[PDB]
Design a protein around this ligand. Structure first.
Ligand SMILES: Nc1nc2c(ncn2[C@@H]2O[C@H](COP(=O)(O)OP(=O)(O)OP(=O)(O)O)[C@@H](O)[C@H]2O)c(=O)[nH]1
Ligand SMILES: Nc1nc2c(ncn2[C@@H]2O[C@H](COP(=O)(O)OP(=O)(O)OP(=O)(O)O)[C@@H](O)[C@H]2O)c(=O)[nH]1
Ligand SMILES: Nc1nc2c(ncn2[C@@H]2O[C@H](COP(=O)(O)OP(=O)(O)OP(=O)(O)O)[C@@H](O)[C@H]2O)c(=O)[nH]1
Lengths: 54, 427, 14, 50, 438, 62, 427
């Protein structure tokens, strides 16, 4: 198991959060959360939409 | 083989257990419908400590849901995972709670205690050998305390040889919503200390502070809080489920956790909590885990143990680690604050490493703690109790229920006895 | 909308 | 800035423990042994045995 | 003939053991199936394995060991490992309940029901065995299940079988690292129980094992796999006289007779000299003199004792590989001339030399060096009493403030036995001091 | 039997209080000896100066 | 290995620190995005002295920006390198300074010192071993001096074994804009000499004169002035991170610089400054560097040391040089003006040579000076204090803050002690 702490292990460091659309990030992962709000701006956009028509 | 059955009590536990179970199901790869997707052999091996085998590879949750208001169960039953839940496990009453502790403890419980006892012993006979049980409820909740205090009292005697895990949330110090809640809290906690061996204390305000601190998403749901606390509850349970050279038994933990019986209140602690850009700005290393792992801001349970002293500390590490980094980090933290622990015991650290990373991240950990910070908690409930009982505010309900002030006299004396119990060891 | 279906007991199940 | 205060405070020969405090040097004597003031008696011993 | 039996109590004692046969199976060329190539080595079980494995007419090398455990997890995963076919199924004794780090639990609650079954294994192993010089006991002092169960089994095997050797091997408690505060409880409990019965108890401490790794092996991040590797070649070296011959062969009986000076104390210290990294072996040279200097360098010992803070009684060196009588005898003669090393005035000679022709081999996918000449240093000195001296002031306080006693008394024990162990210990230092006085 | 007795109501009083005489650990024991060396008050284990937006005296609910 | 963490203090320091960090980033060749472009091995080796390594080949700066007004950090954030700075390090308050020393020293800092201590110790725990710290601020700055005196004090007891390097700019002697600045300067400088060990003295007017003398470009920007001080502050730091036989430790230098504890104030000096045509008119030789190095038109710190004598002189040469040139140049200057040194110490010169040239020019140098030319500085500030304390003008604010006239009395006496101290040692 040569790896352990290799001298260049950072080059081998793969983030857990390369992007929001990543396969490994599942529900059991706290990094993938659900109260996180990309919808916040979407709420903002549609709050403007609804308010106007209201 | 040794397994666990869960109890979902109180209307909070209705959200608590619901989120708690679905995290487990999503962790182990079972569909909402129930037909398990065979994907991981190891989680295929040890599901029987919590779930039984039904027809066609459906893994039934072994928990019993009890409440009074049907609407809560209906939403729980009609939730994303109520179909995996059993109406066999749905026991309830046909009366209104009123959020009265005595009603659920003397009036409403009396005709439901027989029914729930029959259900649980049937589930007890369904399984072979248990470690014990665990309970999602609250100390300040009308039904949950009322049913919980009843059930903890009864479950003590028939199986006096198992693990009586308890999980209760402490209401917000700034506002309790319910004004008789401190009466309900004092009534519940008086019996709680007499029965329980393990207890988790959780506060909503700190979770909101954590939301302000690392979540940084302004507006979460209470379910989002449920998701956080479930992960802590999941993390402690990952010990038993998963392989790796870590000693998982709560009794293995309990003997290392508490030196004297009266210490049953234990506080949680969790590992990497991250913000918007910092997921890709974090060098995920055991040091920075450990630094964040021991942060006064990383605390969520009751209040800052900066005020008090550290009696026993136990951190379980989930992921691909090694015995040495945790060893030196244990040295580093020991040298960092050698005085900040109690001189009563040296080497008060208990470490475990789970080699199986969670599903979504690799480097993770959980903490269970017992420090001298709970004095802030029951001091608050004390002078609360003083002011109301001094002029017996909100009392005719319980006398109408048949409750007398003498019951409270030993309740406060028992609590104030525990007040002496902490410091005189500590100071 | 509350699916008031399971609430029905046997004498009152419809 | 300790250096200035100790000399500006008055007493030149601050006893230096060993150094004989000259009968003229003793200036502002510390307040009588008192716990409430900033001369709690615990310190008073320490200088003496020193 | 010339054989022995291995017993592994506790999940601490198992992974270290699992490495041993993983190591052992290579030098014999054992295939994971349990069968040799087309080469003819099978029989009724009589070849190099006859002292180690049982490759009878069935043709399957059956290890002569019983693993005893209390938790199915770790024992089952190795029953799903790679050599699980080799291992006899019920030899790998497990349990469904733990001792919860309690000595007494495994010693009283669960010990009675389990020991008979392994005693059944013991005698069925005993009846097939022929010469069975002794046993190989691998345990741990800070044993959650190792501590209590090892003591009880050692009681029953001692009372029924008292005429052979009992070889004990446990990880010594870390002087400054404690993963459990109940560890001092059962550790001294184990020691006082084991003083009057154990034949030869050998200890080791993992911190100094780690210290070597980034010293000369240059590994800042080793593992159990490496940790079990280093202790694994240690027991391989002591068993080299068994598997291979040499200029002279030595046996456990000679070890016990020559090592332990006086009763009670039978606790020597092991060391392995040619510990070095891969390349560090390359551009340098190995000979007897420097390794004879290295073997006695104070920082190469695995127990946190300063040899100058003690005095030597016994020292046994086991030379495995290509060595000659000429260099070694002059080298040790120069050693006897050394002034800093302080053997007790009692012994003019205190050196037991073992010469084995066979060079130690590397393991495929390993991290050891390329050793042509190796030596194992089993030594006993008076610098060891500090370890128990460390433990007693650790124990005297916590017993006076009696932490966690409510568990032990709550499960059915009392304080008199805890009272016994301390003067059992307190005698040990004063005895170590009276003998330490010349 | 002793009972707590507080002062009247204020407006800019804080809810809570810290009292570092009993809220210091680095010098925890040290401040303890002077607690009796002066004898101000130890009394009940569990006292504060500000319960919630309320005043009292030094004598903790005695 | 030993490293350094920087503090970006005051509203000028925010401005200054932005330039100093981008100069370092450009010097080492990191893009403004953060993806380091591997070009020089030596700068690849010795960046950990200042920058920690983030994910993806990103070298996170180990500096902390602190202020009160939201205008600055956003402009700093919206700069070409604000993306490289961490919002974790962006700590600030929600009030206006008023350019008040006491508010920054007693009122506003008090609820902010707690957080900044946490940030630095988190950064301190992130590192292993430090030489010390360096701080960028101004002596007459309202918040920089207000917090700086606080912050230097806190790190004094926290780590009394490190480098308390300070980088401060004195305002313009002819006029100071801030009328209470001499009060701010005199109050702040009192605590500095107690706590500081190193002090760089920089004045704006000299930079304008340097702009008049060698820049010759009429209208620069203030950042261009920051470019100069960043180049100089980088130049002194070139010693540590570059190879070559020069002993770089500030302690190595400080013991060569400080014969007596009260010697804290040191003046900078720099090497070739070139005008429009002189780039193609200059034959770069060690002699002409040395002459221009010791030019009265080359100074930028305070004023002419012609008025006094020279206590200690130390110049570090950056580029491809050798002893034989510096030796004779060192001999020549001693033979040039032997008498202008003090008879107290002979051979007051300390020489270090950095073999690694800068990026753009080959032969360069920096100078740090101790000459008796600071007396004019604090005797200047002396009359101002008296000219504003005789009728206690502009004093009502600080009494409302909680300042009393006695605090002034010892403070000025402390500087007055320095007046004799500098005078008596030389005169
Ligand atoms: N389910 C749920 N419970 C909450 C929430 N916020 C606070 N709680 C508290 O959790 C406590 C425990 O719930 P229960 O024990 O079921 O309460 P109860 O016995 O029905 O009586 P009540 O306190 O009136 O609800 C409640 O008293 C609430 O104060 C929330 O968002 N969801
Ligand atoms: N021998 C050995 N010891 C280990 C290993 N890894 C860790 N240890 C140490 O050995 C100790 C194990 O003792 P115990 O935990 O009491 O083992 P046990 O009594 O068999 O039962 P458990 O408590 O379930 O492990 C631990 O405290 C570790 O410090 C290992 O691989 N081999
Ligand atoms: N931004 C900026 N500051 C300058 C400039 N020239 C001089 N300064 C001075 O640099 C000093 C240090 O800034 P800070 O320490 O942050 O000042 P402060 O505490 O916020 O209060 P003030 O000094 O009154 O601004 C200020 O007092 C300015 O007078 C300039 O060109 N730009």
């Amino acid at each position: 198991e040569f790896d352990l702490s290799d001298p260049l292990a950072l080059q081998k460091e793969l983030p857990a959060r390369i992007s929001d659309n990543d396969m490994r990030n599942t529900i059991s992962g706290m990094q993938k959360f659900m109260g996180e709000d990309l919808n916040f701006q979407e709420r903002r956009r549609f709050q403007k939409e609804q308010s106007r028509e209201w | 083989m040794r397994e666990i059955v869960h109890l979902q009590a109180g209307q909070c536990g209705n959200q608590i257990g619901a989120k708690f179970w679905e995290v487990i199901s999503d962790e182990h790869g079972i569909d909402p419908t129930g037909t398990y997707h065979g994907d991981s052999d190891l989680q295929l091996e040890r599901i029987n400590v919590y779930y039984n085998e039904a027809t066609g590879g459906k893994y039934v949750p072994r928990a019993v849901l009890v409440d009074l208001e049907p609407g809560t169960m209906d939403s729980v039953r009609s939730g994303p995972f109520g179909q995996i839940f059993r109406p066999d496990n749905f026991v309830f009453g046909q009366s209104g709670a009123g959020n009265n502790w005595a009603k659920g403890h003397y009036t409403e419980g009396a005709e439901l205690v027989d029914s729930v006892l029959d259900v649980v012993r049937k589930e007890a006979e369904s399984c072979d050998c248990l470690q014990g049980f665990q309970l999602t409820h609250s100390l300040g909740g009308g039904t949950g305390s009322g049913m919980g205090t009843l059930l903890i009292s009864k479950i003590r005697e028939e199986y006096p040889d198992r693990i009586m895990n308890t999980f209760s949330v402490v209401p917000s110090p700034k506002v309790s919503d319910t004004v008789v809640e401190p009466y309900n809290a004092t009534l519940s906690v008086h019996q709680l200390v007499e029965n329980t061996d393990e207890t988790y204390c959780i506060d909503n305000e700190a979770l909101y502070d954590i939301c302000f601190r690392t979540l940084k998403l302004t507006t979460p749901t209470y379910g989002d809080l449920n998701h956080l606390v479930s992960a802590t509850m999941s993390g402690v349970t990952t010990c038993l489920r998963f392989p790796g050279q870590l000693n998982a038994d709560l009794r293995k933990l309990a003997v290392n956790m508490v030196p004297f019986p009266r210490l049953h209140f234990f506080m949680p602690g969790f590992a990497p909590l991250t913000s918007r850009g910092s997921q890709q700005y974090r060098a995920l290393t055991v040091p920075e885990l450990t630094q964040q792992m021991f942060d006064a801001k990383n605390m969520m349970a009751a209040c800052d143990p900066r005020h008090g002293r550290y009696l026993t500390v136990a951190a379980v590490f989930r992921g691909r680690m090694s015995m040495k980094e945790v060893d030196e980090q244990m040295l580093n933290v020991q040298n960092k604050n050698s005085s900040y622990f109690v001189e009563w015991i040296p080497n008060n650290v208990k470490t475990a490493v789970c080699d199986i990373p969670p599903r979504g991240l690799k480097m993770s950990a959980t903490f269970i703690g017992n420090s001298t910070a709970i004095q802030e908690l029951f001091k608050r409930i004390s002078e609360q109790f003083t002011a109301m009982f001094r002029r017996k505010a909100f009392l005719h309900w319980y006398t109408g229920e048949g409750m007398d002030e003498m019951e409270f006299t030993e309740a406060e004396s028992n609590m104030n006895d525990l007040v002496s119990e902490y410091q005189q060891y500590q100071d | 909308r509350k699916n008031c279906s399971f609430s029905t007991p046997v004498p009152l199940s419809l | 800035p300790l250096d200035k205060v100790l000399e500006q405070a008055g007493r030149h020969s601050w006893v230096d423990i060993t150094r004989p405090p000259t009968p003229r040097t003793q200036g502002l004597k510390t307040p009588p042994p008192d716990p409430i003031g900033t001369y709690t008696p615990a310190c008073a011993k320490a200088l003496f045995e020193a | 003939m010339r054989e022995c039996i291995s017993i592994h109590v506790g999940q601490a004692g198992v992974q270290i053991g699992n490495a041993c046969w993983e190591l052992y199976c290579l030098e014999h060329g054992i295939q994971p199936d349990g069968q040799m190539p087309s080469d003819k080595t099978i029989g009724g079980g009589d070849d190099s394995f006859n002292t180690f494995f049982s490759e009878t007419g069935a043709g399957k090398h059956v290890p002569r060991a019983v693993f005893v455990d209390l938790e199915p997890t770790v024992v089952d995963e190795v029953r799903t490992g790679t050599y699980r076919q080799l291992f006899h199924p019920e030899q790998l004794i497990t349990g469904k309940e733990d001792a919860a780090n309690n000595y007494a639990r495994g010693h009283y609650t669960i010990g009675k029901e389990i020991v008979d079954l392994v005693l059944d294994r013991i005698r069925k192993l005993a009846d097939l065995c022929t010469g069975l010089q002794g046993f190989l006991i691998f345990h741990s002092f800070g044993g959650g299940t190792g501590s209590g169960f090892a003591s009880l089994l050692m009681e029953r095997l001692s009372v029924d079988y008292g005429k052979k050797s009992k070889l004990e091997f446990a990880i010594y408690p870390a002087p400054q690292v404690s993963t459990a505060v109940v560890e001092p409880y059962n550790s001294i409990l184990t020691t006082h129980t084991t003083l009057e019965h154990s034949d030869c108890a050998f200890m080791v401490d993992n911190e100094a094992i780690y210290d070597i790794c980034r010293r000369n092996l240059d590994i800042e991040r080793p593992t159990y796999t490496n940790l079990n590797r280093l202790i694994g070649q240690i027991v391989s070296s002591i068993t080299a006289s068994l598997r291979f011959d040499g200029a002279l062969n030595v046996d456990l009986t000679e070890f016990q007779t020559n090592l332990v000076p006086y009763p009670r104390i039978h606790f020597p210290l092991a060391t392995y000299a040619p510990v070095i990294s891969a390349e560090k072996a390359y551009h340098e040279q190995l000979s007897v003199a420097e390794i004879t200097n290295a073997c006695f360098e104070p920082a190469n010992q695995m127990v946190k004792c300063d040899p100058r803070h003690g005095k030597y009684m016994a020292c046994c060196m086991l030379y495995r590989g290509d060595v000659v009588p000429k260099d070694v005898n002059a080298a040790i003669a120069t050693i006897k001339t050394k002034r800093t090393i302080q053997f007790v005035d009692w012994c003019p000679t205190g050196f037991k030399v073992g010469i084995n022709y066979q060079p130690p081999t590397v393991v495929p996918g390993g991290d050891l060096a390329k050793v042509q000449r190796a030596v194992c240093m089993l030594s006993n000195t008076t610098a060891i009493a500090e370890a128990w001296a460390r433990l007693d002031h650790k124990f005297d306080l916590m017993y006076a403030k009696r932490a966690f006693v409510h568990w032990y008394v709550g499960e059915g024990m009392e304080e008199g036995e805890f009272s016994e162990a301390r003067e059992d210990l307190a005698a040990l230092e004063k005895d170590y001091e009276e003998v330490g006085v010349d | 039997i002793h009972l707590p007795r507080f002062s009247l109501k204020q407006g800019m009083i804080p809810t809570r209080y810290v009292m570092p005489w009993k809220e210091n650990m680095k010098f925890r024991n040290v401040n303890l000896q002077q607690a009796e060396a002066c004898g101000i008050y130890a009394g009940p284990l569990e006292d504060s100066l500000f319960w919630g937006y309320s005043e009292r005296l030094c004598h903790g609910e005695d």
